[PDB]
Amino acid sequence: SGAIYVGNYRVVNRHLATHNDWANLVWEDSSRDLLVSSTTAQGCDTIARCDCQTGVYYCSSRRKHYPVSFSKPSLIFVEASEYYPARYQSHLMLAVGHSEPGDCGGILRCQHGVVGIVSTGGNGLVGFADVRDLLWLDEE
């Protein structure tokens, strides 16, 4: 698990979104495994506005941060979980690294700030859902 807190926005894995997330839905994209919900408290996270392909992500399944090279946000085919059937996830960035289901919501960051959150794993790969294209997270 894990979320991004920027302005009055909470960003989670759509598949980990709570009843309260859906009651306060701002925006959800099934194909990106992203949901944003409205917060009352102001968030302190800075979203990266950049095209960095290196950073650090938190892996809860190792209680460790890993430096990674990652691919540019792309339409990558994602296999089976139970949360989704087997479909193309958009705005997804792969790196070589450990990603268990419970690693989802771990943050990827570069010097510019938060790049994305863990969304996929398996086969020695870690998918991150990009959030840098969501410029609207940085105003009202």
Contacts of 50 (CB under 8 A, 6+ apart): 110, 112, 115, 132
21, 33, 103, 130: the active-site residue: 33
State the Cα–Cα distance between residues 74 and 91, nearest whole angstrom.
5
15, 45, 65, 98: the active-site residue: 15
Find the shortest distance in angstroms from Cβ 96 to Zn ion: 19
Using DSSP's 3-state secondary structure scheme, residue 12 falls into: strand
Q: Phi first, then psi: what are they for 16, rounded to 5°?
A: -105, 0
Q: Could you confirm whether 15 is annotated as catalytic?
A: yes
State the Cα–Cα distance between residues 37 and 34, nearest whole angstrom.
10
According to the binding rule CB under 5 A, does residue 50 interact with Zn ion? yes
Q: Is 50 annotated as a binding residue?
A: yes
Region of 36 (left: φ > 0; alpha: ψ -120 to 50; beta: rest) is beta
Find the shortest distance in angstroms from Cβ 101 to Zn ion: 27
Contact 118, 50 (CB under 8 A): no
91, 103, 104, 130: the active-site residue: 104
Q: Could you confirm whether 65 is annotated as catalytic?
A: no
Q: Is 59 annotated as a binding residue?
A: no
One residue of 26, 52, 76, 125 binding Zn ion per CB under 5 A? 52
Question: Quick one: DSSP state of residue 45?
Answer: P
According to the binding rule CB under 5 A, does residue 110 interact with Zn ion? yes
According to the binding rule CB under 5 A, does residue 48 interact with Zn ion? yes
Would you list which residues are annotated within the binding site for Zn(2+)? 50, 52, 110, 112
Under the rule (CB under 5 A), what is the footprint of Zn ion?
A: 48, 50, 52, 110, 112
Query: Catalytic residue numbers?
Result: 15, 33, 104
